[PDB]
Amino acid sequence: QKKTIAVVNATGRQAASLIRVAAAVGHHVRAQVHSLKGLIAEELQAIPNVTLFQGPLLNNVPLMDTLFEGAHLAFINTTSQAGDEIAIGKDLADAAKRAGTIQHYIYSSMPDHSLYGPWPAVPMWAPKFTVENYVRQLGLPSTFVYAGIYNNNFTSLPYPLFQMELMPDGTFEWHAPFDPDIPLPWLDAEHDVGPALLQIFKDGPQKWNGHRIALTFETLSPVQVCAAFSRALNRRVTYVQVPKVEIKVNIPVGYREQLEAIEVVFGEHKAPYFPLPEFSRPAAQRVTDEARKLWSGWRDMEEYAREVFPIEEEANGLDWML
């Protein structure tokens, strides 16, 4: 029988991608979800091999102990939502070590930029690095994956930072603080995270214990992203660098503070998205090497812009794609 994988925030893009491919090949999944309501939660309730455990993570160790019971593998990706990401991250790691049966613990981590230059720590990223350091100290056989920017963030709706805005004449414009020519790491979370994580588990601790892996299959500067959308949609697409991220809709304070940090780190300092020496300087050799080695079936930005974006846009009530 395939191994049992414990997962949290099951409805999130990363966890859901892994659950789908894992259950399909025979793995049993023990997954935590904050609510059983919702299209993804219901989708997951429909999969036999998946067992859902509804409840919060924040200070809910008993659910954690239950989650890991009989689990052989784990893929943990936390969020800043509950307000105690480090606490939850340490609790999950402690619970996994306590289970005694976890052979491989994959934690989705991020950089703490303040460690690499005269830059601010990015609010929703730095805490994850603190959790990674704790996981490393536990001695739990582990691997740390660093997700690139989700291709899925793009929308013509007035959401911050990644608005591919539709102009009156049918052209699109994307305004953000990123330097137009510095390449950024991108990731088609839905399509590529699951396959990549499965391969990391197949390779095992022998191959990745204590390693960091950048989960990005393509790096593109903002102008290269626009060129991909342009070729995909046969419309002009233009990138415009702006110092501040305009907020046109109500957003959580947490995201608000995240955006302010992005303006400083990328707008002002033009710092790397993955500033760790192994990803920046030694680059990885390209930063996409390991991800591509793990999964060669990845989807590029141009294909996403041509095949997926129009479908998600229609589903969001837009009709420019007729």
Size of residue set near Cl ion by CB under 5 A: 8
d(CA 301, CA 312): 14
Min dist. Cβ of residue 287 to Cl ion (A):
29
Considering only residues 73 to 132 of the shown chain, the ones binding Cl ion according to CB under 5 A are none
- Of 88 and 271, the one with the shorter C-beta distance to Cl ion is 88
Q: What is the b/e burial string over 63-83, where b = at least 16 CB atoms within 10 angstroms of the residue's CB?
A: bbebbbeebbbbbbbbebbee
Report which of 227, 229, 224, 205 is spatially closest to residue 155, judged by C-alpha positions. 229
Query: Do residues 89 and 131 lie in contact, with contact meaning Cβ atoms separated by under 8 Å?
Result: yes
Q: Is 151 annotated as a binding residue?
A: yes
The reply to whether 234 sits near Cl ion by the rule CB under 5 A is no
Residues followed by a break in the chain, C–N over 2.5 Å? 284
Alpha-carbon gap, residue 30 to 84, rounded angstroms: 23
Which range in 16-24, 103-111, 113-121, 248-256 contacts Cl ion by CB under 5 A? 248-256
The nearer residue to Cl ion, 107 or 298, going by C-beta atoms, is 107
By beta-carbon proximity to Cl ion, the closer residue of 36 and 321 is 36
Q: Which is nearer to Cl ion, 116 or 159 (CB)?
A: 159
**What span, in angstroms and rounded, lies between the C-alpha atoms of 51 and 53?**
7
Which listed range, 139-147, 177-185, 214-222, 245-253, lies at the site for Cl ion (CB under 5 A)? 245-253
Residues 6+ apart with CB under 8 A from 141: 102, 103, 104, 105, 205, 209
Contact string 188-227 vs Cl ion (x = CB under 5 A) = ----------------------------------------
User: If you ran DSSP here, which 8-state letter would residue 83 be given?
Assistant: S
What share of residues in the chain are helix, strand, coil (percent, to 5)? 40, 20, 40
Stretch near Cl ion under the rule CB under 5 A, chosen from 2-10, 261-269, 274-282, 291-299: 2-10
Position among 25, 39, 249, 322 found at the interface with Cl ion (CB under 5 A): 249
Q: Is 163 annotated as a binding residue?
A: no
Rg of the chain over Cα atoms, rounded to whole angstroms, equals 20
What is the closest distance, in whole angstroms, from the C-beta atom of residue 119 to Cl ion in the complex? Answer: 31
Q: Which is nearer to Cl ion, 175 or 236 (CB)?
A: 236
Residue 128 annotated as lining a ligand binding site: yes
Residue 315 touches Cl ion, criterion: CB under 5 A: no
Q: Residue 236 or 269: which CB sits closer to Cl ion?
A: 236
CA-to-CA distance for 255 and 182, rounded, in angstroms? 23
234 marked ligand binding residue: no
Pick the closest to residue 36 from 70, 11, 64 (CA basis).
11
**Is 9 one of the binding residues for Cl ion (CB under 5 A)?**
yes
**Interaction of residue 250 with Cl ion, rule CB under 5 A:** yes
Binders of Cl ion among residues 31 to 50 (CB under 5 A) are: 33-34
Asked if residue 236 binds Cl ion (CB under 5 A), the reply is yes
Measured CA to CA in angstroms, residue 122 lies from 111, 133, 256, 312 at distances of 8, 17, 12, 29
Measured from the CB of residue 267, what is the shortest distance to Cl ion in angstroms?
A: 24
| Interface contacts to Cl ion, rule CB under 5 A | 9-11, 33-34, 236, 249-250
Q: Residues annotated as binding site for NADP(+)?
A: 9-14, 34, 77, 128, 150-153
Binding residues for NAD(+): 13-14, 77-79, 128, 150-153
